[PDB]
Amino acid sequence: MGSHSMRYFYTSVSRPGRGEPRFISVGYVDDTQFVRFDSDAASPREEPRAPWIEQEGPEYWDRNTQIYKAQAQTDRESLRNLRGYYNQSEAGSHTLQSMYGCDVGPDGRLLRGHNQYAYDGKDYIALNEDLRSWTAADTAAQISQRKLEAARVAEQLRAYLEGECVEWLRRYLENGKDKLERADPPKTHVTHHPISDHEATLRCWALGFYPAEITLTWQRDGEDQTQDTELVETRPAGDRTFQKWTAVVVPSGEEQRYTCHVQHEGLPKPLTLRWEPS
């Protein structure tokens, strides 16, 4: 509780025969996206994707734009190098993803930092939680590891993660505050959907909530049930909020033996819900 994160998610995708690799970057505070950049835009620039960041001055947008353009160029070198490390053909498309950022507590102090990479969707190399050492997946990534060590890169990342990452995340939370520090509890209900003469589905809904983290669980006679349940992935409503449901198939006539249990940061205490045949 009360903790926050900032994250940047970079995607570079090669496309031999169809130009240079695309670079896309999005930035988030918790579950709220606030910026983007796309190298395939007509005039690539970092752009606002939340209202509260629009106040930042031209020097912010300019700096960050120049960062992404340089990162795009660096990722293109990385893609070339990785193709070589894996003895791969120049004819295929490959993906390099990058994630970094910081987690802070209620007091604003660093809880942990992150800086890791994936190649073709598989973990490649990661900054360890010490912010000093690396973990490599395989002999290709050991090459990258030696290069990062030689250039003293962990040191630079540590300084960013302990320093600017936290400091800017705090600035966003403080002026961004009405949206970022506000948890919205789910609105909850249970619906009933006859399947046959013998069985019915009970579906336990959670709507309009933020942040995305939630737990929904069905019990029978006060015992956790996973048999004959279905739990959908938490999904975005499009208005900053999220939705989720869990369902269970029950013998018709036994509906009142089932309870749905809801836990969310916006809730003072967990909820338990039953179907109410109105």
């Binding site: 940047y8 970057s25 930035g27 912010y60 960050n64 960062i67 992404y68 340089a70 990162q71 160029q73 660096t74 990722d75 070198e77 990385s78 190098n81 990785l82 390099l96 970094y100 990479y117 490649y124 190399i125 990534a141 990258s144 290069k147 990062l148 250039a151 890169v153 630079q156 990342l157 960013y160 600017e164 990452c165 800017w168």
Partner: peptide, 9 residues
Amino acid sequence: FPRPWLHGL
């Protein structure tokens, strides 16, 4: 606020 480019892999 993003970090800079670092070094290639």
